[PDB]
Write a protein that holds these residues in place. Structure first.
Motif, PDB file in Angstrom:
ATOM      1  N   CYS A 111      -2.768   4.033   4.953  1.00  0.00           N
ATOM      2  CA  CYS A 111      -1.683   3.873   4.118  1.00  0.00           C
ATOM      3  C   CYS A 111      -0.652   4.911   4.559  1.00  0.00           C
ATOM      4  CB  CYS A 111      -2.150   3.846   2.654  1.00  0.00           C
ATOM      5  SG  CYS A 111      -2.911   2.659   1.994  1.00  0.00           S
ATOM      6  N   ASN A 150      -7.280  -4.339   2.731  1.00  0.00           N
ATOM      7  CA  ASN A 150      -6.025  -5.207   2.735  1.00  0.00           C
ATOM      8  C   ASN A 150      -6.327  -6.698   3.021  1.00  0.00           C
ATOM      9  OD1 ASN A 150      -6.395  -4.457   5.511  1.00  0.00           O
ATOM     10  ND2 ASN A 150      -4.453  -4.875   5.780  1.00  0.00           N
ATOM     11  N   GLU A 193      -4.799 -10.434  -3.637  1.00  0.00           N
ATOM     12  CA  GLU A 193      -4.318  -9.766  -2.327  1.00  0.00           C
ATOM     13  C   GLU A 193      -4.766  -8.335  -2.667  1.00  0.00           C
ATOM     14  OE1 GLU A 193       0.369  -8.545  -1.701  1.00  0.00           O
ATOM     15  OE2 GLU A 193       0.393 -10.688  -2.177  1.00  0.00           O
ATOM     16  N   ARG A 194      -4.984  -7.801  -1.584  1.00  0.00           N
ATOM     17  CA  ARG A 194      -5.314  -6.345  -1.544  1.00  0.00           C
ATOM     18  C   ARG A 194      -4.329  -5.589  -0.595  1.00  0.00           C
ATOM     19  NH1 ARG A 194     -10.061  -9.127  -1.299  1.00  0.00           N
ATOM     20  NH2 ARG A 194     -11.467  -8.550  -2.999  1.00  0.00           N
ATOM     21  N   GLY A 195      -3.752  -4.423  -0.932  1.00  0.00           N
ATOM     22  CA  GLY A 195      -2.834  -3.441  -0.214  1.00  0.00           C
ATOM     23  C   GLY A 195      -2.713  -2.017  -0.776  1.00  0.00           C
ATOM     24  N   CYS A 196      -1.950  -1.078  -0.479  1.00  0.00           N
ATOM     25  CA  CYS A 196      -1.535   0.329  -0.750  1.00  0.00           C
ATOM     26  C   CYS A 196      -0.384   0.083  -1.824  1.00  0.00           C
ATOM     27  CB  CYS A 196      -0.899   0.724   0.568  1.00  0.00           C
ATOM     28  SG  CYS A 196      -2.119   1.276   1.894  1.00  0.00           S
ATOM     29  N   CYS A 222      -4.100   2.163  -4.531  1.00  0.00           N
ATOM     30  CA  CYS A 222      -4.318   0.957  -3.944  1.00  0.00           C
ATOM     31  C   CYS A 222      -4.356  -0.304  -4.819  1.00  0.00           C
ATOM     32  CB  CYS A 222      -5.631   1.002  -3.313  1.00  0.00           C
ATOM     33  SG  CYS A 222      -6.305   2.098  -2.182  1.00  0.00           S
ATOM     34  N   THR A 260      -9.067  -2.856   6.291  1.00  0.00           N
ATOM     35  CA  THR A 260      -8.589  -1.714   5.515  1.00  0.00           C
ATOM     36  C   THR A 260      -7.288  -1.338   6.340  1.00  0.00           C
ATOM     37  OG1 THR A 260     -10.688  -0.603   4.919  1.00  0.00           O
ATOM     38  CG2 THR A 260      -9.448  -0.007   7.221  1.00  0.00           C
ATOM     39  N   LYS A 261      -6.407  -0.581   5.750  1.00  0.00           N
ATOM     40  CA  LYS A 261      -5.062  -0.146   6.064  1.00  0.00           C
ATOM     41  C   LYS A 261      -5.029   1.352   5.784  1.00  0.00           C
ATOM     42  CE  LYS A 261      -0.653  -2.012   4.709  1.00  0.00           C
ATOM     43  NZ  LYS A 261      -0.348  -3.123   5.581  1.00  0.00           N
ATOM     44  N   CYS A 278      -6.570   1.915   1.887  1.00  0.00           N
ATOM     45  CA  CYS A 278      -7.046   0.749   1.014  1.00  0.00           C
ATOM     46  C   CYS A 278      -7.745  -0.405   1.695  1.00  0.00           C
ATOM     47  CB  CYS A 278      -6.098   0.282   0.004  1.00  0.00           C
ATOM     48  SG  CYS A 278      -5.182   1.797  -0.618  1.00  0.00           S
TER      49      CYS A 278
END
Length: 62
Positions: free
Chosen positions: A17, A5, A38-41, A24, A14-15, A3
């Motif tokens: 995951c 992040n 916020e952005r994450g998995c 995501c 990016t992460k 994703c």
């Protein structure tokens, strides 16, 4: 299973995951300091005030 992040888009991070996780997440709320994303998995239960979206696929969350 990758994703974004990064916050309110800042410079893009990016992460990878965790294995299994095929979502995501993009959340947006705002408060005394401004608006935030916020952005994450994922996908969070996502919450009063919320702001939430989840895709399935790579770099999805934007």
């Amino acid at each position: 299973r990758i994703c974004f992040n990064q916050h309110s888009s800042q410079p893009q991070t990016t992460k990878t995951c965790s294995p299994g996780e095929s979502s995501c997440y993009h959340k947006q709320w705002s408060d005394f300091r401004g608006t935030i994303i916020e952005r994450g998995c994922g996908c969070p239960t996502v919450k009063p005030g919320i702001k939430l979206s989840c895709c399935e696929s790579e770099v999805c969350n934007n």
